Design a binder for these strands. Structure first.
Ligand code: GTP
Ligand code: MG
Lengths: 360, 682, 49, 49, 103
RNA sequence: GCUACCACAUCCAAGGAAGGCAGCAGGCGCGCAAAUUACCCAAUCCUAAUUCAGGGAGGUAGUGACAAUAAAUAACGAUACAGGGCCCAUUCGGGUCUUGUAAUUGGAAUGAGUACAAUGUAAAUACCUUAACGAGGAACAAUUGGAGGGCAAGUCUGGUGCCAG
């Protein structure tokens, strides 16, 4: 009701920031100049999910559907089941719970049903191997994601199980100012109701692109035989590069189109991974907002993270503007001394935040 | 040999005495604030004369008419803010207990250890014990030195039961000339000048201040046209302790005993009582007391009259007008729902990534001291990245760190406050969190205090100090039936802990709080006033909470193993709601209710495990949910004019007495004495 | 004044809670409930485990 | 004893027969019932024999 | 036992078996403390579940050895420390209502 | 004490100017813990130009369950009413006897204490003396541990009814 936003910009991020702050927000003029002007089904179902995991949180949707009033409550959590609508996958319905999970009154055991792959949002293996290590660095210990059945577009029938146990008081502030030596490159190519020949063709194209390096490279094959395969057939590949010493990881992933060549898919994913590593600095460009908001809610202390000038872009700017508007916090940015690159140390005074919802 | 072994054991024991629990200091090493010293005692023990003698020695200034907080300098690096608390105002005592860091506890000598001294000891011990220091006055009245030394030793040992043993207390002899003996005052002042303090959690997590100077800012013609009822814009001057107060306008602070405000404007001002080393460095880079509310020199300011004695990518980002595309255009020369980032086309990426050299470049003793070293490392990294940028960081992102004069102007402040404010009482400002601005019901655990006589009743008001606020609520005292339910009680137990749940503003778990009963000086009497103490355990917006009612019926036709019970319900529709259920008797035998009857309306048949008798009573245990009343009432004592005898909700016994009723009673529930006969069977 | 208004409504609530705490207790918030004490069919109106 | 107060060793008293059932005298507790069942089972045992 | 001394300081970390049903039992009188000399966690009794309600969390207790004489029916073989002091004050004084717990 | 050279360090009108004891008491050395910045040179001596001045040398008090010695918190009756009290055994059981009571009641004795006082002392404090008051349980209200029981229209758990924990 008090902090006012415009447009359909950063819906789940704004909801998460409202919940973590406690400041009541109102998002107005949502998709005004359209022919079905208002909200979306995945948007209203995400609001249903937020109301299901919190307590005493008042959400009201205008009859025009272009103005949402959110007044946030406390974070109960628990064990639940969300049947996501088919327009968006469970990666999109999971990532805000990755923001909100370990700061709750109870542990998180949620069972998501729907599609588990898209070109837009996060795949399950991507979200595991890519976003879990950032949280395990920031200091949550027992977190995991099981895959009971794995869907595929446009039919899905996939079930994932998010389980997060460690309820920490606040994330420990991080001091990463270096550029991690990448140890190895691993990956995984999965397939629902198509052939092991297609799986091996994907991994062969990937290794053919990555053959020009020296580090160890290993991609596993994951065919899904039987009842845990969903309805529609499809395939996809996910690649990660691990720095074993500090335990960092960068990643890129994609799926197979309706009539594309698996070798070309492997080439595209390998080149996207190498481009992300070239445009990376101690984080991924898709991991960045997670680590930024965690350093913001870390305790009352300067936290330091080495990011890249290329990693500064439009979305970084709009994220920092949203953070400045909600938490009243600024990111100081000092350039690193070394002149072969133009890395910037980001120092954020993590504001005083505590997991005040827990029971003792 | 033996000497080596015995000194090994002794050294081991003293090391394991010296270990501790790591806490974060949060105090400025550079320019620390004045330590706050608070004089507490009964209303006759000479604390004005003590504060006058201490100021006169500390700064060589005779200082009549002490009122309001008063900061003086001491040593090369210390300043002391002396503050007198009144002894008629339990709210003032509670505020002092939360804010103070050294407590000068002055107690009478001819008369021993009054209740106000004991009360302040216990409320400070609950809200976190600051460094306390006893002095004992009135020692001239003792006739014989045997009586004098006996009294000295008895007060000393009761005090050592209260505080750590060996807490030294200073004996002041006579009030000869509006002051005390200079020898004992020198010893006292040297001790409080070399006092050493310890880290406390509430201070080291919250930003707070004690307001020195006070003024309101409204137009006289605005007052004239609106008619004196208008909320007045008020400025507040003082120091800053504890935690960096954020420099952005729009925050929520509690002025204790007034209300709950966002600040309107904040302005850093340089201290009028500066440290000697501060002034040394000030004069070096260029090439005494401060007491607004009281007298100083020979001049005192009134409301308006006077009385005098006769004689850059970062700022491009955080600019809000510019489109981000224009910002990145300037720095060089979309949404986030697409979690995949933007990329380059496939053939361009492959053509660029024929080569791998540009990325082959990047490719391949005591644990207490360890933890305290980690804290120190983080503190020094804090320090150097603070030192990196002066006009941006320490002005804005670091807030206004402790030890800086600040002026803060507010809105919506009450006319009652501005009019009836008299400067003998303190005004504390604590910086709340969003967790302490929200509301819900809190679950604490608490006992009745050990020196309070009467036990506390469920759904009966209780004023309590929790956080900065001092609000009156209706708690509900519950137990958990061996960790199964949350059944409510009707009283608190007399010598142990019971859970409690009550409406009110929320505070962090593990927070100690302390509740009193009646707080009027016109209602004190002679009993101890502190009522309950405990810790708030958890927060919620809704708890389930249960009261047990047992439906009672009597048998009227018994058989072998089967009876017709008659009086529990009213209708066969009711019994059909309740059928198949589990009943027992007073006599202990179990059974179930099995079927409704038809010709009488509320009768049923039940099967038991032995032949029930006619004399007995069947019962059905049932769990009805109760709900917590939503009464919330802050004190606002210094908004009130008299500032004592704040009277809110009365207690149940006093309500019955004032309305001339009598206590309810059940004569079929009062116990009797039973003498049963030895029974013989055929 | 605004403080005067606020204390007026709080005084009203004070009077209400005083009358409630002195008045008679609800049949369900007794113990040992009998059919001659509760209202008729109130046990079907209500909900208890 | 060991680590038990007297208020912890309180001695709870016992309730008597409800007043409206003074005809059906002396509400029977567990001790009286166990006397009854003991004697009934003795009689039944000798009858079975 | 824990090395040199007779008594060992430690931080209360968690409260084992608070969720048990039957009051005044072994798993209800047990807590878990981490010794500060080693940073090493180990489990330890308190007497009297009331005194369990005294000791809370992150609270600087001081343990001593337990010293059982003969085996009991329901006691846990293996816990070897009891709590003597809690944050400077002694649990027996807190229990007998002589002193208070300062923070 | 003086003169150099090293090191901290004070004041200013900016030219200049001055500086250093764990002896006695009192502190800091951790964020967690301990005797008074008292009295006197009256004794013991010492220093002087010397009977007389001086002396934190030494003496006098204050502080405290480190240790060490002595010993209070009661004694003597008079009733009244009851019939059971105690000891041994692995078992049946055996052995012995004016005992048991929060039941009534009488006068005597006294110091912890508070002090007229005097003594003690450089002046005091304490001790040793003694007028005046000062004992019936809430008075003048001693502790610290250890071994047992059973009580509810109480709660929890297991079970082959009414049981077991
Ligand atoms: N005989 C004697 N009188 C004292 C002593 N100390 C204080 N007084 C008396 O107490 C009065 C001083 O009162 P305050 O010190 O102001 O008492 P306060 O509680 O601090 O403040 P007020 O309650 O406002 O007096 C003077 O009139 C003194 O005569 C003492 O040691 N001996
Ligand atoms: Mg005064």
């Amino acid at each position: 009701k008090y902090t006012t936003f415009q447009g359909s910009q950063n819906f789940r991020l704004r909801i998460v920031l409202a919940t973590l702050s406690g400041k009541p927000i109102k998002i107005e003029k949502i998709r005004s100049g359209d022919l079905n002007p208002g909200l979306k089904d995945y948007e209203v179902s995400f609001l249903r999910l937020i109301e299901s995991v919190t307590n005493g949180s008042v959400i009201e949707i205008s009859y025009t559907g272009t103005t949402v009033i959110y007044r946030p409550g406390i974070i109960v959590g628990g064990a639940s089941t969300h049947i996501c609508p088919s327009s968006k996958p469970v990666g999109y319905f999971v990532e805000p719970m990755l923001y909100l999970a370990p700061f709750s009154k109870k542990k998180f055991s949620i069972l998501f049903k729907g599609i588990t792959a898209s070109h837009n949002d996060a795949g399950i293996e991507a979200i595991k191997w890519g976003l879990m290590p950032v949280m395990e660095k920031f200091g949550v210990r027992e977190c995991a994601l099981h895959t009971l059945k794995r869907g595929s577009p446009p039919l899905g029938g996939g079930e994932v199980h998010l389980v997060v146990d460690s309820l920490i008081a606040q994330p420990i502030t991080m001091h990463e100012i270096d550029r991690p030596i990448i140890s190895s490159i691993t990956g995984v190519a999965y397939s629902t109701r198509v052939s092991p020949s297609l799986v091996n063709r994907m991994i062969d194209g990937a290794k053919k692109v990555l053959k020009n390096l020296q580090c160890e490279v290993n991609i596993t094959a994951d065919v899904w035989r039987g009842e845990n395969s969903g309805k529609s057939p499809g395939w996809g590949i996910t690649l990660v590069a691990q720095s074993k010493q500090k335990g960092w990881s960068y990643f890129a992933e994609d799926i197979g189109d309706a009539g594309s060549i698996p070798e070309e898919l492997g080439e595209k994913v390998a080149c996207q991974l190498l481009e992300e590593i070239s445009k990376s600095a101690a984080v991924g460009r898709n991991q960045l907002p997670l680590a930024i908001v965690y350093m913001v809610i870390g305790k009352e202390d300067i936290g330091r993270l080495r990011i890249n000038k290329e990693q500064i872009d439009e979305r970084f700017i709009i994220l920092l503007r949203d953070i400045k508007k909600i938490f009243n916090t600024e990111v100081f940015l000092k350039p690193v001394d070394e002149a072969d690159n133009e890395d910037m140390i980001a120092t954020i005074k993590g504001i005083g935040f505590t997991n005040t919802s827990k029971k003792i | 040999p033996g000497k080596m072994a015995r000194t090994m054991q002794r050294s081991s024991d003293v090391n394991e005495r010296k270990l501790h629990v790591p806490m974060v200091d949060r105090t400025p090493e550079d320019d620390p604030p004045p330590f706050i010293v608070a004089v507490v005692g009964p209303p006759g023990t000479g604390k004005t004369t003590l504060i006058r003698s201490l100021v006169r020695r500390m700064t060589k200034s005779t200082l009549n008419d002490i009122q309001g907080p008063i900061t003086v300098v001491s040593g090369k690096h210390r300043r002391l803010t002396f503050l007198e608390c009144p002894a008629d105002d339990l709210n003032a005592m509670i505020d002092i207990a939360k804010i103070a860091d050294l407590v000068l506890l002055l107690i009478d000598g001819n008369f021993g250890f009054e209740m106000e001294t004991m009360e302040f000891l216990n409320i400070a011990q609950h809200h976190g014990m600051p460094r306390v220091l006893g002095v004992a006055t009135h020692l001239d009245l003792f006739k014989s030195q045997s009586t004098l030394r006996a009294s000295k030793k008895r007060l000393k040992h009761r005090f050592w039961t209260e505080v750590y043993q060996g807490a030294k207390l200073f004996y002041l002899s006579g009030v000869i000339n509006g002051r005390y003996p200079d020898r004992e005052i020198l010893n006292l002042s040297r001790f409080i000048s070399v006092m050493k303090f310890r880290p406390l959690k509430w201070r080291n997590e919250h930003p707070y201040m004690l307001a020195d100077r006070f003024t309101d800012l409204t137009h006289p013609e605005l007052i004239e046209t609106q008619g004196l009822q208008i909320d007045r814009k008020v400025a507040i001057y003082g120091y800053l302790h504890g935690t960096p107060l954020p420099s952005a306008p729009g925050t929520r602070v509690h002025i204790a005993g007034v209300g709950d405000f966002s600040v309107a404007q904040i302005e850093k001002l340089p201290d009028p009582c500066p440290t000697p080393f501060y002034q040394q460095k000030l004069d070096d880079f260029e090439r005494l007391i401060y007491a607004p509310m009281s007298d100083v020199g020979g001049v005192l300011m009134d409301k308006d009259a006077v009385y005098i004695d006769i004689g850059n990518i970062g700022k491009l980002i955080y600019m809000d007008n510019i489109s981000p595309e224009e910002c990145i255009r300037r720095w060089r020369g979309v949404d986030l729902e697409k979690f995949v980032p933007y990329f380059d086309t496939f053939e361009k990426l492959a053509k660029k990534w024929k080569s791998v050299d540009a990325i082959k470049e990047r490719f391949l003793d005591t644990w207490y001291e360890l933890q305290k070293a980690k804290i120190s490392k983080q503190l020094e990294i804090n320090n150097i990245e603070y030192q990196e940028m002066t006009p941006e960081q320490r002005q804005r992102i670091e807030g206004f760190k402790a030890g800086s004069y600040v002026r803060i102007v507010f809105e919506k402040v009450p006319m009652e406050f501005v009019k009836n404010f008299n400067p003998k009482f303190p005004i504390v400002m604590g910086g709340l969190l969003p967790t302490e601005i929200k509301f819900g019901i809190v679950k604490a655990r608490l006992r009745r205090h050990r020196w309070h006589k009467k036990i506390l009743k469920t759904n009966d008001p209780l004023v309590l100090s929790l956080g900065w606020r001092r609000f009156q609520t209706l708690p509900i005292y519950t137990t958990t039936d061996s960790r199964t339910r949350t059944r409510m009680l009707k009283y608190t137990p007399e010598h142990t802990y019971c859970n409690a749940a009550f409406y009110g503003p929320l505070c962090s778990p593990n927070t100690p709080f302390c509740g009193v009963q009646i707080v009027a000086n016109s209602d004190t009497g002679n009993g101890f006033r502190i009522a309950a103490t405990g810790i708030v355990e958890e927060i919620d917006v809704n708890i389930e909470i249960v009261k047990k009612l047992k439906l009672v019926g009597f048998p009227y036709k018994i058989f072998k193993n089967t009876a017709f019970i008659k009086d529990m319900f009213s209708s066969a529709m009711e019994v059909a709601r309740f059928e198949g259920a589990q009943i027992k008797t007073v006599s202990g035998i179990r059974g179930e209710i099995k079927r409704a009857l038809s010709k009488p309306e509320g009768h049923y048949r039940a099967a038991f495990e032995d032949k029930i008798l006619m004399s007995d009573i069947v019962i059905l245990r049932s769990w009805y949910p109760v709900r917590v009343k939503k009464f919330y009432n802050p004190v606002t004592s210094l908004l009130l004019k008299e500032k004592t005898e704040w009277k809110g909700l009365r207690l149940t016994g006093q309500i019955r007495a004032a309305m001339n009723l009598e206590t309810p009673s059940n004569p079929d529930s009062a116990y009797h004495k039973i003498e049963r006969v030895e029974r013989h069977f055929n | 004044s605004s403080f005067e208004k606020q204390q007026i409504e709080i005084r009203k609530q004070i009077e209400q809670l005083e009358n409630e705490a002195v008045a008679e207790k609800k049949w369900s918030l007794k113990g040992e409930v009998k059919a001659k004490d509760r209202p008729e069919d109130a046990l079907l109106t209500e909900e208890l485990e | 004893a060991k680590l038990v107060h007297d208020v912890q060793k309180k001695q709870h008293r016992e309730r008597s027969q409800l007043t409206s059932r003074s005809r059906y005298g002396f509400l029977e507790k567990h001790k009286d019932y166990v006397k009854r069942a003991q004697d009934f089972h003795r009689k039944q045992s000798t009858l079975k024999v | 036992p824990f090395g040199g001394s007779s008594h060992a300081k430690g931080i209360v970390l968690e409260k084992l078996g608070i969720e048990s049903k039957q009051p005044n039992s072994a798993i209800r009188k047990c807590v878990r403390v981490q010794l500060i000399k080693n940073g090493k966690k180990v489990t330890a009794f308190v007497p009297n579940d009331g005194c369990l309600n005294f000791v809370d969390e992150n609270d600087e207790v001081l343990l001593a050895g337990f010293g059982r004489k003969g085996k009991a029916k329901g006691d846990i073989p293996g816990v070897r420390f009891k709590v003597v002091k809690v944050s400077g004050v002694s649990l027996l004084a807190l229990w007998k209502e002589k002193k208070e717990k300062p923070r």
